[PDB]
Amino acid sequence: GSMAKAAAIGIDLGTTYSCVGVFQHGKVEIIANDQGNRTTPSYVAFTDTERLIGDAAKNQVALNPQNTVFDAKRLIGRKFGDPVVQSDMKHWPFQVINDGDKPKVQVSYKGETKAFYPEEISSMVLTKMKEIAEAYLGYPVTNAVITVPAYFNDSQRQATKDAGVIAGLNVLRIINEPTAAAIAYGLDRTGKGERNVLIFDLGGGTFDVSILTIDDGIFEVKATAGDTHLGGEDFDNRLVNHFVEEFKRKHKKDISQNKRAVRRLRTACERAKRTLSSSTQASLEIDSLFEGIDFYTSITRARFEELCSDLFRSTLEPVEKALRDAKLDKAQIHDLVLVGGSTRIPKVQKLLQDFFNGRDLNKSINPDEAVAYGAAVQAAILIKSTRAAA
Template identity: 35%
Template sequence: MSCGIYFGATSICLALHKDGKTDVVANDSGDRVTPAMVAYFGKDRNVGLGAKQGRIRNASNTIVNVKHIIGKNFNEPFIQKLVKESSCKIINQKNLPVYEVESNEKRIAVTPQEVLVLIFKKMYSIASSQGGLDVMDVVLTVPTNFTTEQSNTISKAASVAGFRICRIVNEASAAALAYDIGQDTSAEISNVLVYRLGGTSMSIAVLNVNCGMYRILESYEQMDCGGSHFTSSLVEACAVEFKRQWRVDVRDNKRGMAKLSNACETCKHVLSTLNTASTFVESVHEGIDFQNKVSRAKLESLIQSHLQECLQPVDKVLESAKLTHVDIHKVVLVGGSTRIPKLQQLLRAKFPEAEMLNTLAPEEVVAIGAAKQAALISGHDDIQLLDVESVQGECIPYALLVKVSNSDETSLQTAVPKNTYIPVRRQHTYTVQEDKSSVCIGVYCGEEGSTEEECILVAKLVLTDLPTDCQKEKQVTTVFHYRREGSIHITCTEVVSGKSSGVTIETGESSAFVGESSKSVSEDVNNTAATPEQ
């Protein structure tokens, strides 16, 4: 069983690829995302929804936003800001930030790594409820700016929890894969902007998709911009309204403000789908109940400045990537805060010609893409590769090039790009001239952009006795399947007549593609290609 995990600052999501399908798994509460929180209460440790529900009464022992302090030094300005704002005490331990909580009537220090292990154990139990305990292959996702040390910390925690780590990929590439960008049409070339706005942070990445490969052109992340700011604006407005009604300032009551914040967060979510919502808090201050009706227009006016702040970095990222708004073909929305209709409207105004991809739940997009990548690595599906710069594994150091005789293809065309991770499947279709009864497919090994003389012929497939009197245009579909063990299986089929030919280049013969000398391949593979399969 293969799964993908998106570990965010405020929530974590797990998707499974099983029986050819990819879907998000609901937790024991029926929710498809789980709060990334851990709470210590007496002898118990609550993870997920239980920790969130008890946060108001147990704020000093509830650990949140652990993702933000992984791999950071205690003296960094951002950590110092967290120390001042966090309800749970953060202390300095060997220049590293560590949480101090009360457990079993004792004050103990809890490292971020220990918190991660507890959260991943919770996700492992959720995955186990779907069966497949014997194999739990997982692809983890991390932000594009994560260091190797930070990625390894998350990977080790997941391993301790019981997962078998296949690969770590960046969140932007996983989000693009969730929508199969560049996978359905291998020849597709496009620029994709992945816009993520979560609970406490935002990130923007620009990807270039070429022949199914993802390359990050530019990325940006901001830690103090997220959906929590929208909630805070609504909380402040409700506090002002409470004071107007009762002549009492609830802002001096921490517990009352915590209750009001929970109610406003729920109200904000409702306003993403409905035009009006109500906030009701029982005994918010000195036994006084509070109820307030909020419209979507009211919320949008309150958060207008925050929305503009969230969109300003988009122009900077495009400028750094040397692109304009017209160059972006697709926009992928990630993160729960992108559900806000006004934000989507502003993004559409910025990219009027781009396709807005928001059919998948934004909190689940990254996990779904990671699960698809896990299926590929585990050999459970023929999904294609992910971003070259963000993954590690065996890859092809040379490109596979094709020349088709008796067609419009007069020069070498790239079939499988250099640095493609295996296993991988590529399909290309070529048009054959109507008066030709045969076609020859020549497959070469070399650098992209090289001439025929500079490349090595590794296979030649010939289709003969093709119809010349057909009314339909003749097309030859060629499939390149680079298998896990290193062998290459190439088949070509003429669509009208159904005639086909194929050849398999075995592992030893194709060793040049994974790093050995190319001289032996040109000799051995030519012998293999001389007797194609009919």
């Protein structure tokens, strides 16, 4: 009579990392890619012979900086003249060109100079997330919910849908990232009455705070605040500067001019930073870092906390601003939700908990997975086609 329907997927199309989930058997499965990773870098690389997407693109970035594209989400739906675009271009090793006041990324690919619109690069990331899902389900996937930041305008939302259409996905809906994180915790299933929810989203490069009101499952965005110059990469930079100084003291050598040594140092720092979220100390062990000198050292969580102390405290300024904009007091917030890998930092959790007078933080769903989790819950709801009984 009626063939079984394929599952719909939920995609968190992130600035630095993307995540895909599917709701089946009353639960969400976050789908790992073929290298066993539950999140996939939003990177696309171009060579004379291949186009690489995800981990394969990010793993070859050091020697191919001009032809490895990342951060397309910062360009999507924006004009070339937009002041945000002009400032961001100074930090990118790839070329951004002007095509009718619309930015395009220009690379060497298969023997030619090729330019792509940001939605075309995002469609390549979406094609990889669709293939990750089809490898797990064992059949072709058509339907998806894709998330966007709450501050995205109409042009940014339409370009995200366009990226989905290019990838061969039927876009069921574009939903806000803070709404998806709230849905992940079932905060829209608590029945009658108003609930105020604060979403605290600390990413690789930016920080976003959102205040939502939920009434009978209806979401209203009350306030958004944040810091475009605060993320995980700033904490990595503080460790980098600390270890460059430490090498100077110990071996009387300045390593800061050998890109390879700095890159090996930063890669090691990011991993030490992750270890410090679970351990009270972490070792750093690099062989022949500079002039054949082995760099074997350690860092305590207390020293790391001191190195980033001002940056961690500054996350509370957009929280107070969002609360003023929403015209609410901190005691009036019913639920606190953590989003982003950087929220695993114990000190970040402690500062926010202390600000909300000891309140529990919702962090049981991996913070780097909560947005895709909620998007997958919504995708399964949107494809239901139940006919009422008499």
